Amino acid sequence: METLFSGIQPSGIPTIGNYIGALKQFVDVQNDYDCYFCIVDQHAITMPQDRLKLRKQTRQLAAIYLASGIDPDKATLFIQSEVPAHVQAGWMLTTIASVGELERMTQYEGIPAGLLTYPPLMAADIVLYNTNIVPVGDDQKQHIELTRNLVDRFNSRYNDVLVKPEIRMPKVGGRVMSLQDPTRKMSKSDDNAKNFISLLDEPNVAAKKIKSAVTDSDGIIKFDRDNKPGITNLISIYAGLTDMPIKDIEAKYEGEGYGKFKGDLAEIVKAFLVEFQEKYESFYNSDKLDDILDQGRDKAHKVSFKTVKKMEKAMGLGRKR
Amino acid sequence: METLFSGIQPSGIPTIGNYIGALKQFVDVQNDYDCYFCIVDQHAITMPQDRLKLRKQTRQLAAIYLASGIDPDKATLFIQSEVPAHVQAGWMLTTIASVGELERMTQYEGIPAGLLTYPPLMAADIVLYNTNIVPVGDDQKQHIELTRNLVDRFNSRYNDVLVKPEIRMPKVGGRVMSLQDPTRKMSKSDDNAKNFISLLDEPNVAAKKIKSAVTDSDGIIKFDRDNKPGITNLISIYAGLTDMPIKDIEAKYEGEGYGKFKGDLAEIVKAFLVEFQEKYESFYNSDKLDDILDQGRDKAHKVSFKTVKKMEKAMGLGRKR
Ligand SMILES: N[C@@H](Cc1c[nH]c2ccccc12)C(=O)O
Ligand SMILES: N[C@@H](Cc1c[nH]c2ccccc12)C(=O)O
Structure with missing residues (x-):
């Protein structure tokens, strides 16, 4: 089974066009692909966010995904900040990225540094799960190109542990x-x-x-x-x-x-x-939503822990135990 | 008791001058200050590192510190990558830092991005333990100034949870x-x-x-x-x-x-x-060194987990549970 990773921004409600175009499609392809739906709260704070609404928006997106029929046993629905491997692998890949690479992504009170340094964290989000495919739009082509290049760079300098993903939506919905x-x-x-x-x-x-x-x-x-x-x-x-x-x-x-x-x-x-x-x-008003997100978090952690452990070993971080 | 934080680079042996100037001093002041000695393996990979030697160098520095009389019950000796809170808080503070701030620190095949983005991670290393004092040299004044400014910025925008540190070595050793x-x-x-x-x-x-x-x-x-x-x-x-x-x-x-x-x-x-x-x-050749580092890791985690939890709540990351 191919592994799919979709990062979900918690900063606004999907429309019926989003639902016909992707969500309804994910509800089908979660049977035939190993699907990761990550609510990227740590990517959201790269941008202006109100602290008191952000947790709500994160609960809304999880509720919307579940109400669509995203199935927490078939797929892995979880919140990004709850899985430490994302900033662990994201820091590791930041060290092998270049300033120029990051600068060219921002082209394609001060300028918040998260807008410059998020792309390696996005790369980490994907490869942590040995992702094969990412259903993203043409505005993310540079991000996947950086991801593949960081995977080549990592595998070549340290040793082959990470998987290069492709941009691919298994069943394209209709355009609304x-x-x-x-x-x-x-x-x-x-x-x-x-x-x-x-x-x-x-x-x-x-x-x-x-x-x-x-x-x-x-x-x-x-x-x-x-x-x-x-x-x-x-x-x-x-x-x-x-x-x-x-x-x-x-x-x-x-x-x-x-x-x-x-x-x-x-x-x-x-x-x-x-x-x-x-x-x-x-979903939004039930206690079981927290159980569902706990289970999703646990599933994502069990997979990405192994990935982060292989990365740390390959780079010589931490200890042999 | 005031809390002290020292970050230790695992990339070369301290000299007798380092020992007279700081290490022997730490062995005394660990009785009267709550001391954190962090082996910063994640800062080390911002620079050229050989993967096969880095783990060794990390074990060497821990062995040197313990042989000096750094006491794992009185103080907290641990490896940075083993405590996820460092890259968690470091990402959080990166989002409120500015590109210009980071660029001006680098002034005071491509240029590896870790050399640009490490200062918020250094800030995170310190404030995670509610550090009062940092025994660093004049070459780190800009880093502590950024740390204090990020603490002011964080407390003012989200809510007061982080402590501003001062540069201070409690008992200055002789200059060698x-x-x-x-x-x-x-x-x-x-x-x-x-x-x-x-x-x-x-x-x-x-x-x-x-x-x-x-x-x-x-x-x-x-x-x-x-x-x-x-x-x-x-x-x-x-x-x-x-x-x-x-x-x-x-x-x-x-x-x-x-x-x-x-x-x-x-x-x-x-x-x-x-x-x-x-x-x-x-110390270097004993199994108990791994127990000592496990205990140090556990102590650092128990303190910085609370700090990272307060930061995530203040920014609206994750979930209320
Ligand atoms: N950067 C994406 C969100 C995202 C983060 N990590 C990802 C991994 C795969 C796909 C998307 C993502 C956005 O701006 O919407
Ligand atoms: N940046 C320091 C190491 C370090 C990381 N975090 C720290 C916190 C406090 C003191 C030192 C550090 C160095 O280059 O040596």
Whole structure:
């Protein structure tokens, strides 16, 4: 089984576009890949963070992942700071990185040093679990290139212990776009909140967002990205939440116009969110969430401890015992 | 009781000058201060290190410290990489440091990034134990200034949990100088090996070093740094190893010349090293050294765990449990 590692920032709610694009996909591929979902609280404090909200946001992301169907027995869901191996391996790889390498990543009151020194810690996050694949976007290509180079450097200078990962998402979800700007990806931090549907949006608010999506006044329900990106995006969301094949959506709405389809889809979005948020609340407000995160932490520790031990031995840190 | 923290680099043997200047002093002040002697193996890999020798050098320094009389019940002697709190707190303080701050420390194949990012890890090493005093030299003033500023910054932004240290050596030992250049401090890395007496020099070699020290051909045994730095340095070494007051050395050698005094002192240096190295061997080659380092590691962990827990809570890392 190939090992997958996804680092999750605890600084904002995934949208329905995030869920159709990755989360729902992870819920499937966790059966066929050894999956690591790391809530990277130590990467989050490289950026401005409010101390009193950060713990909450970390609990929210774990709750969202679990409510999506991320399964704590099949996968390893854990918080980064709770597994010391991350800053242990991250310091080790920082020593073999170069200032220039780190500086070129920042190009692709003072400037907080975490924004400069996080890339070796990201590399450590991945290789600690002998990761084969990382499902990241093109904005992280430099980070994986640095990771592979640090793995080559480490193995060549000390001895082969670390695994080079590849960027790879085993099952790419459909692309969901901004509801009032269908050429851009949907983003949780849009200034126009009608552009995204958050997984924690009020369900009624989210149906209104479907009704407010920018489309032609009417038309056929047909998939056509280039000419009708507005209705097409809506059809992609319909597909993502129902699992209806797109051609099967076209058949169901043959002879129907936008009013019927948008009304139906808004009810689908509403219903998905009512079900998702009830699962989300029951995870977020339960004592067992702390047990689940403890188990995840323990599983990540048992694997990365061996990795960090091999690294320390290879570099001559610590003691032979 | 005030808490003291000394970071020990595992990259070369202390000399008799190091022992008279600090080690013998620590053996006394460990009764009246809560003393932390940290073998900083993670700072050592910021610099070129051979993986196969580094573990040895770390065991050597622990053996040297114990042979000096550093007492593992009175003090805390431990290896830095064995206590995860150091890279945990070190990452936390790196996030609030600035690139400029780190860059200005480096002024006072590529340039290894550890040489840039170690100062917050040094700051972490100290404050983890609520250190009051650090016995360091003027070459570390910038490091302690950064440490105090990071402590102010941390306490002000998150909440008061960390203690500002001062540079202070409770009992300054005598200054020992190069045996063939008595204006410079004695250094373990001199290119002229007759300048230093290593604690692991062959005892016979070390007496010859006393006999080879650069002095006048003859003279009175009198302390006078400005006019007779050569014989004066030798008298300071005689004092350091015998505990004879300098005026009492002058009395014993009234009417004597350099030949008698140097011959005596060489026998004293030889005898000190025979006793020190027998203690050094028995620590270095015993199984109980690993027990002593385990106990030291455990003591350092029990204290710095609380400190790192307060820092994580103050920054909002991890979980409330
Ligand atoms: N750097 C990623 C988060 C992250 C940290 N470590 C990772 C390892 C793999 C993938 C992602 C990550 C981000 O900014 O979102
Ligand atoms: N930087 C010190 C070693 C060190 C690391 N942490 C410390 C804390 C206190 C004193 C010294 C240290 C040196 O170069 O020698």
